[PDB]
Curated annotation (Swiss-Prot), chain A:
Probably forms a homohexamer. Interacts with RVB1 and may form heterododecamers with RVB1. Component of the SWR1 chromatin remodeling complex composed of at least ACT1, ARP4, RVB1, RVB2, ARP6, YAF9, VPS71, VPS72, SWC3, SWC4, SWC5, SWC7 and SWR1, and perhaps BDF1. Component of the chromatin-remodeling INO80 complex, at least composed of ARP4, ARP5, ARP8, RVB1, RVB2, TAF14, NHP10, IES1, IES3, IES4, IES6, ACT1, IES2, IES5 and INO80. Also belongs to the R2TP complex composed of at least RVB1, RVB2, TAH1 and PIH1. Interacts with SPT15/TBP. Signal peptide: none annotated. Disulfide bonds: none annotated. Belongs to the RuvB family. It is found in: Nucleus, Nucleoplasm. It comes from Saccharomyces cerevisiae (strain ATCC 204508 / S288c). This is RuvB-like protein 2. It comes from the Eukaryota.
UniProtKB/Swiss-Prot annotation, chain B:
One of its GO terms (molecular function) is enzyme regulator activity. It comes from Saccharomyces cerevisiae (strain ATCC 204508 / S288c) (Baker's yeast). It is found in: Nucleus. One of its GO terms (biological process) is DNA repair. This is Actin-related protein 5.
Curated annotation (Swiss-Prot), chain C:
Belongs to the RuvB family. It comes from Saccharomyces cerevisiae (strain ATCC 204508 / S288c) (Baker's yeast). Probably forms a homohexamer. Interacts with RVB2 and may form heterododecamers with RVB2. Component of the SWR1 chromatin remodeling complex composed of at least ACT1, ARP4, RVB1, RVB2, ARP6, YAF9, VPS71, VPS72, SWC3, SWC4, SWC5, SWC7 and SWR1, and perhaps BDF1. Component of the chromatin-remodeling INO80 complex, at least composed of ARP4, ARP5, ARP8, RVB1, RVB2, TAF14, NHP10, IES1, IES3, IES4, IES6, ACT1, IES2, IES5 and INO80. Component of the R2TP complex composed of at least RVB1, RVB2, TAH1 and PIH1. Interacts with SPT15/TBP and HSP90. This is RuvB-like protein 1. Present with 11600 molecules/cell in log phase SD medium. It is found in: Nucleus.
From Swiss-Prot, chain D:
GO terms for biological process: chromatin remodeling; DNA repair; regulation of DNA-templated transcription. It comes from the Eukaryota. Keywords: Nucleus, Transcription, Transcription regulation. It is found in: Nucleus. Belongs to the IES6 family. It comes from Saccharomyces cerevisiae (strain ATCC 204508 / S288c). This is Chromatin-remodeling complex subunit IES6. Component of the chromatin-remodeling INO80 complex, at least composed of ARP4, ARP5, ARP8, RVB1, RVB2, TAF14, NHP10, IES1, IES3, IES4, IES6, ACT1, IES2, IES5 and INO80. Probably involved in transcription regulation via its interaction with the INO80 complex, a chromatin remodeling complex. Also involved in the regulation of telomere length.
Length: 104, 442, 103, 125
C-alpha cells in the first residue's frame, strides 16, 4: 500500500514567455476544478513537459510532480474525448494498493 | 473557560524621589534613553533606582486653569491621563525635544539632585547604531549648553550589555539585541565592536504588537469592542512563544488533538459537521459556536498567531520587510566574514560562536534560545562548541553596562568628551572608542 | 564469511567546486544535515559519477566511502518554493549525522 | 476626593520657567516638526552631497550599509487568511489560500478594498 500526491483539473489558460535570446522561459498556468481555481508559476522543466504532448485550454490533465509525467484525461464539456471537470480539491493525496506476485 | 483581559491596573502610589542628603556632585548619572522605557540611577548601586515608561502628559485642570505635567509613573494614576500619554520618540528617532527636556528635568528632580549653574555630574547615555548626526547634534545642544555637563559619553546598549557580561573588555563574541524598534546583530572582536559588519532588522516589539492588532482586526471584522494598545501588548506578552520548528508546527496546529491543549481564548471586557471545517476550527476553536450568545460574541481565539507573531524576526518577509532573518545574518557573519572560508571556521569565528549573548527587552519570548541554538547547530560544522547566554532580566543589562564601565576607572576616560573638546572640534566629532559609534568616512 | 564496514555520507549539497590541475584533480563537496555540516575532498571518478546523476547545489545525495556509489535522493525541502510548479521531488533534511559507520 | 488626588501630584513636581536645573544662558532656538520620515532623506542627500564633492578618500561605512540585505534563499508562501501553508493563489486578486472551503467562504464572496488590506501585511500592494 502506497500513497502519491496528484494534480487534477481543467486547464484555463497557458502563457509561455520567451526572452530576447530565449535562454530562459517563464510561464503561467491557470487550472481549475468545480470548487477552486489557481494560477501556478512554471519553471523550465514543467514548460518543456507542457510543450511536449501539447496541452491547450479546456483540456483536463493529470500532473505527477515528483515524476514529471502528465497525462491528458480528455477534453471538458465545452462546445462554445469528452470527460467531466474534476471536483473537490486540486492537490489530492491518493492511495493505491499494489499487488505483485513472487515471480515478478 | 475564557479568561478576561483588561487594561493593566493603575499605580496607587506615585514615584518617590531620592533623599537630597545623599547627593554628591562627583558621582556620575546613568541614563538609558530607551523608547519603551527609561532607566535612571546613580552608578554606586548595581540596580537602577527609577524605571518608568517614557511618556508625558499636559493635563489641564478646569478649576485651576494650569496645565499640569505628569511624567512616567505619574501617568499611571488615571485612565484619562494614561490614554493621553505621548512618547517623545517617533519611530527609531526623536522628533520633538521639549518633551525630552521636560522628562530630563523630571528625572533630575526625582534623582535627589540639588544643582547650580547646570548639572555638575558627568552623564552616561545610549546612542543607536549608525545614528543620524542631527540626533547627536541636538543632544550636544541640550547637554553641553542647557545642562552645563562636565562630560558626555555615547555608546550602544547591546555593546554595553556585552561589557556587563564580559568586564575584561578584551573578549570576543556575538551580540544579538532584540529591542523595541529594531533588532541588531553586532560582532565583537577583541572587545571592540566591528561596526562595519553589524546589521539592522526593522522589526521589534512595537511592530509585533501592531502585527497582532492588524491580524486581530482582520480575523473578526465585526468585533464590537475596540481594544487599546496595552491589551494587545498583554496578550502578546502572555500567550506568544517561538516554535521550535515552524514548518512542522504549521501542519498540525489545527488538528483536533492540538486545540485541546494549545488553544487559548480571551474575552473582551463589557458591562456538514464543524469537525471537518478548517475555517470553524480556525475561528471558534474546538468547541461548537453559539452565535446568539452575547458572551461568545466578545470572545477571541488565539491558535495560529501564538507561533506566527514571534516568527517574523526569523523571516522578515512575513512582516513586509525584504531583509534576511537573524539566522541568515549570523550565518553570513560566522561563515563568510572575519577570514572564514565556508567549511573552515577561523579562530575569531570559533571565539565568536563560543560567546553568543542575547540581550534586549524582546528576548523574553520563550523558546528563543533553543531555536537559536538549533539553527546555529544546523549551519555550523559538526562538533563546534556553541554557548548561548541570556540574563534573567535582559531589559536591564545596558544600565549594568553603564555601572560596570563607570566603576572601571581606566578605560572610562577613553570615552569621555569634555566641554573643551566640544568647543574645539565643534558638534561633528566622534570619540572612536570600543563601546561607541564610528566615523562615517574611512 | 567476510567482515566489512559500511561508511555512508548523506546530506544536502552546499558547495560543489571543481578545479583544474583539461582534467580536474579533485572536487570539494560540502554536505549538510540537521546536526551540522562536513566538507570532503573527492577523487575525479566520484565527480564523474556525480555528473552522471545531475547533482546541483541543494540536492540531498548519498555517498558510500568504500564502493564510491553516489545516489541522488532528491532536492532539499528548503528550496521547494523557488517555483509554484516544478518536476522535482522535495525531501527533508536527514536528522542524523552526515557520517555514519557500521560493521 | 478622587479628583483632588491629581492636584497633589501636580504640586509635587512643578518646574517654574526660571528653572533651577538648566543653565543661565538659555537661548532656545526655534523648533521645527522634523518627522522621522524626512531625517532619512536629509541624511541621504547629505551623504550624496559629500560623495559628489569627494569624487570630483572613498567613504565605506554608511547608513545604507548598516541595514540587513535581502535574503538569498527563497521565501515560504503562506495562506493570507489562516496563516497555514498556501498551496494555491487566486488568479483574480492574487491572494494565497489553503484549500477549497477557505476559498469559497472568504476569497470568492470578497468585497473589493479588502484584498489590499490583506496584502498590506506582507507588503504586496
Amino acid at each position: 500500500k502506497e500513497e502519491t500526491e496528484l494534480i487534477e483539473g481543467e486547464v484555463v489558460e497557458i502563457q509561455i514567455d520567451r526572452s530576447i535570446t530565449g535562454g530562459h522561459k517563464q510561464g503561467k498556468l491557470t487550472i481549475k476544478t468545480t470548487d477552486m481555481e489557481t494560477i501556478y508559476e512554471l519553471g523550465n522543466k514543467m514548460i518543456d513537459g507542457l510543450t511536449k504532448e501539447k496541452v491547450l485550454a479546456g483540456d483536463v490533465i493529470s500532473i505527477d510532480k515528483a515524476s514529471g509525467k502528465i497525462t491528458k484525461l480528455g477534453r471538458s464539456f465545452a462546445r462554445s474525448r469528452f470527460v467531466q471537470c474534476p471536483e473537490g480539491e486540486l492537490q489530492k493525496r491518493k492511495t493505491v494498493v499494489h499487488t505483485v506476485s513472487l515471480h515478478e | 473557560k475564557a479568561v478576561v483581559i483588561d487594561d493593566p491596573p493603575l499605580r496607587q502610589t506615585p514615584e518617590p524621589f531620592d533623599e537630597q542628603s545623599a547627593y554628591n556632585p562627583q558621582s556620575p548619572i546613568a541614563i538609558d534613553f530607551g523608547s519603551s522605557k527609561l532607566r535612571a540611577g546613580f552608578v554606586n548601586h548595581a540596580t537602577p533606582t527609577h524605571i518608568f515608561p517614557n511618556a508625558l502628559t499636559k493635563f489641564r485642570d478646569r478649576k485651576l486653569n494650569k496645565n499640569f505635567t505628569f511624567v512616567g509613573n505619574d501617568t499611571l494614576l488615571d485612565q484619562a491621563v494614561r490614554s493621553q500619554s505621548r512618547s517623545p520618540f517617533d519611530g527609531p528617532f526623536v522628533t520633538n525635544w521639549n518633551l525630552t527636556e521636560e522628562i530630563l528635568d523630571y528625572t533630575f528632580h526625582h534623582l535627589g539632585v540639588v544643582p547650580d549653574n547646570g548639572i555638575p555630574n558627568p552623564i552616561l547615555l545610549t546612542e543607536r547604531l549608525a545614528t543620524v548626526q542631527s540626533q547627536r547634534t541636538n543632544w550636544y545642544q541640550i547637554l553641553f549648553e542647557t545642562y552645563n555637563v562636565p562630560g558626555v559619553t555615547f555608546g550602544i546598549d547591546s555593546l554595553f550589555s556585552f561589557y556587563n557580561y564580559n568586564p575584561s573588555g578584551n573578549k570576543t563574541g556575538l551580540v544579538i539585541s532584540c529591542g523595541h524598534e529594531d533588532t541588531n546583530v553586532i560582532p565583537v572582536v577583541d572587545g571592540a565592536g566591528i561596526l562595519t559588519d553589524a546589521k539592522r532588522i526593522n522589526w521589534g516589539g512595537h511592530q509585533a504588537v501592531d502585527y497582532l492588532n492588524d491580524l486581530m482586526a482582520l480575523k473578526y471584522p465585526y468585533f464590537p469592542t475596540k481594544m487599546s494598545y496595552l491589551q494587545y501588548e498583554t496578550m502578546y506578552k502572555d500567550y506568544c512563544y517561538v516554535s521550535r520548528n515552524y514548518d512542522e508546527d504549521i501542519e498540525k496546529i489545527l488538528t483536533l488533538e492540538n486545540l485541546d491543549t494549545n488553544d487559548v481564548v480571551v474575552e473582551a471586557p463589557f458591562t456538514y459537521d464543524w469537525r471537518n471545517s478548517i475555517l470553524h476550527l480556525f475561528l471558534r476553536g474546538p468547541r461548537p459556536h453559539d452565535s446568539e450568545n452575547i458572551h461568545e460574541q466578545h470572545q477571541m481565539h488565539l491558535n495560529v498567531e501564538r507561533i506566527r507573531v514571534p516568527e517574523v524576526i526569523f523571516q522578515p518577509t512575513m512582516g513586509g520587510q525584504d531583509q534576511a532573518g537573524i539566522c541568515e545574518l549570523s550565518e553570513t557573519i560566522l561563515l563568510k566574514k572575519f577570514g572564514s572560508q565556508p567549511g573552515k571556521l577561523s579562530q575569531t569565528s570559533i571565539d565568536m560562536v563560543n560567546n553568543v549573548l542575547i540581550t534586549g527587552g524582546n528576548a523574553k519570548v520563550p523558546g528563543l534560545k533553543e531555536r537559536i541554538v538549533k539553527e546555529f547547530t544546523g549551519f555550523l560544522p559538526t562538533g563546534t562548541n556553541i554557548t548561548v547566554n541570556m540574563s534573567s532580566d535582559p531589559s536591564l543589562d545596558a544600565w549594568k553596562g553603564m555601572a560596570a564601565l563607570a566603576r572601571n576607572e581606566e578605560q572610562y576616560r577613553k570615552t569621555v568628551i569634555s566641554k573643551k573638546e566640544y568647543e574645539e572640534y565643534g558638534p561633528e566629532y566622534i570619540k572612536e572608542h570600543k563601546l561607541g559609534n564610528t566615523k562615517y568616512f574611512e | 564469511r567476510i567482515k566489512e564496514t559500511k561508511e555512508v555520507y548523506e546530506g544536502e549539497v552546499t558547495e560543489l567546486t571543481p578545479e583544474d590541475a583539461k582534467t580536474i584533480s579533485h572536487v570539494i563537496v560540502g554536505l549538510k544535515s540537521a546536526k551540522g555540516t562536513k566538507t570532503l575532498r573527492l577523487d575525479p571518478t566520484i565527480y564523474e559519477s556525480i555528473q552522471r546523476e545531475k547533482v546541483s547545489i541543494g540536492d540531498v545525495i548519498y555517498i558510500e566511502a568504500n564502493t564510491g556509489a553516489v545516489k541522488r535522493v532528491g532536492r532539499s525541502d528548503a528550496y521547494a518554493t523557488e517555483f509554484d510548479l516544478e518536476t522535482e521531488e522535495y525531501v527533508p533534511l536527514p536528522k542524523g549525522e552526515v557520517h555514519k559507520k557500521k560493521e | 476626593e478622587r479628583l483632588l488626588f491629581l492636584r497633589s501630584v501636580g504640586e509635587r513636581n512643578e518646574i517654574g520657567f526660571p528653572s533651577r536645573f538648566k543653565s543661565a544662558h538659555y537661548k532656545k532656538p526655534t523648533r521645527r516638526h522634523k518627522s522621522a520620515r524626512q531625517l532619512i532623506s536629509d541624511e541621504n542627500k547629505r551623504i550624496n552631497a559629500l560623495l559628489t564633492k569627494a569624487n570630483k578618500l572613498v567613504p565605506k561605512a554608511t547608513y545604507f550599509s548598516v541595514e540587513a540585505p535581502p535574503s538569498i534563499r527563497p521565501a515560504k508562501k503562506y495562506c493570507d487568511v489562516t496563516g497555514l501553508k498556501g498551496f494555491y493563489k487566486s488568479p483574480t486578486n492574487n491572494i494565497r489560500y489553503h484549500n477549497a472551503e477557505i476559498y469559497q467562504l472568504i476569497v470568492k464572496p470578497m468585497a473589493p478594498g479588502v484584498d489590499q488590506e490583506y496584502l498590506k501585511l506582507r507588503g504586496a500592494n
